[PDB]
Amino acid sequence: MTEYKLVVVGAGGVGKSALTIQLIQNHFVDEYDPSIEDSYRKQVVIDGETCLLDILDTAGQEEYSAMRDQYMRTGEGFLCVFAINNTKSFEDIHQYREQIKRVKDSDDVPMVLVGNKCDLAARTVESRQAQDLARSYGIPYIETSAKTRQGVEDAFYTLVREIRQH
């Protein structure tokens, strides 16, 4: 009965739902899930140990959602995802991290910064800046892509492994 509850956050509008879908389906889609039946659970092997990975998608309002409000309050873990071709996508996570940081001034919660389309030449300033941005916020940076580059899945595993260590 081992379950890991990780909350999905990141740029608003890119495709947080799609990244959740491709985890459970093993395929990248454009269709997004409705607030109803948004969050999913998936049986996975992490750290060599078989466990249940619970991916929490937000529902309804930004400020009023049990999927964020309840689970984030626990602080078990959450993933920050953004679009590498979207300049503004950085800002959304910057708000999330700095705001959560104030809440987590006394708490132990794993964080990972993930940028997509790392196989796509058409993107913002080199991801090296995203690493520097991640470093300024004291968090690791993972590269992912819908194309080939695996990041999101490994990043969620990293969050779980960080839970296993802490």
Curated annotation (Swiss-Prot):
Q: How would you summarize where this protein is expressed among tissues?
A: Widely expressed.
Q: Name one GO biological process term.
A: animal organ morphogenesis
Phenotype when changing T144I: GTP-binding activity reduced by factor of 25
**Consequence the record notes for mutating S17N:** Dominant negative. Prevents PLCE1 EGF-induced recruitment to plasma membrane. No effect on subcellular location of isoform 2
Q: Name one GO molecular function term.
A: GTP binding
**What PANTHER family does the entry give?**
RAS, DI-RAS, AND RHEB FAMILY MEMBERS OF SMALL GTPASE SUPERFAMILY (PTHR24070)
User: This chain belongs to which protein, by name?
Assistant: GTPase HRas
Position of sequence motif Effector region: 32-40
| S-nitrosocysteine PTM positions | C118
**Subcellular location field:** Cell membrane; Golgi apparatus; Golgi apparatus membrane
Protein family per UniProt? Belongs to the small GTPase superfamily. Ras family.
Q: Where in the sequence is N-acetylthreonine found?
A: T2
List the InterPro entries hit by this protein, alphabetically: P-loop_NTPase (IPR027417), Small_GTP-bd (IPR005225), Small_GTPase (IPR001806), Small_GTPase_Ras-type (IPR020849)
Please name the NCBIfam families in this protein's record.
small_GTP
Subunit structure of this entry?
In its GTP-bound form interacts with PLCE1. Interacts with TBC1D10C. Interacts with RGL3. Interacts with HSPD1. Found in a complex with at least BRAF, HRAS, MAP2K1, MAPK3 and RGS14. Interacts (active GTP-bound form) with RGS14 (via RBD 1 domain). Forms a signaling complex with RASGRP1 and DGKZ. Interacts with RASSF5. Interacts with PDE6D. Interacts with IKZF3. Interacts with RACK1. Interacts with PIK3CG; the interaction is required for membrane recruitment and beta-gamma G protein dimer-dependent activation of the PI3K gamma complex PIK3CG:PIK3R6. Interacts with RAPGEF2.
Q: Which disease is it linked to?
A: Costello syndrome: A rare condition characterized by prenatally increased growth, postnatal growth deficiency, intellectual disability, distinctive facial appearance, cardiovascular abnormalities (typically pulmonic stenosis, hypertrophic cardiomyopathy and/or atrial tachycardia), tumor predisposition, skin and musculoskeletal abnormalities. Congenital myopathy with excess of muscle spindles: Variant of Costello syndrome.
- EC id: 3.6.5.2
Task: Give the function comment from the record.
Answer: Involved in the activation of Ras protein signal transduction. Ras proteins bind GDP/GTP and possess intrinsic GTPase activity.
Quote the catalytic activity from the record. Answer: GTP + H2O = GDP + phosphate + H(+)
| Major subcellular site | membrane
| Keyword field contains Acetylation | yes
How is activity regulated here?
Alternates between an inactive form bound to GDP and an active form bound to GTP. Activated by a guanine nucleotide-exchange factor (GEF) and inactivated by a GTPase-activating protein (GAP).
Impact after mutating Q61I: Moderately increased transformation of cultured cell lines
Give me the residues that bind GTP, please.
Answer: 13-18, 29-35, 59-60, 116-119, 145-147
Task: Provide the gene name from the record.
Answer: HRAS
Q: How is it modified after translation?
A: Palmitoylated by the ZDHHC9-GOLGA7 complex. A continuous cycle of de- and re-palmitoylation regulates rapid exchange between plasma membrane and Golgi.
Outcome after substituting C118S = Abolishes S-nitrosylation. No stimulation of guanine nucleotide exchange
Provide the species name.
Homo sapiens
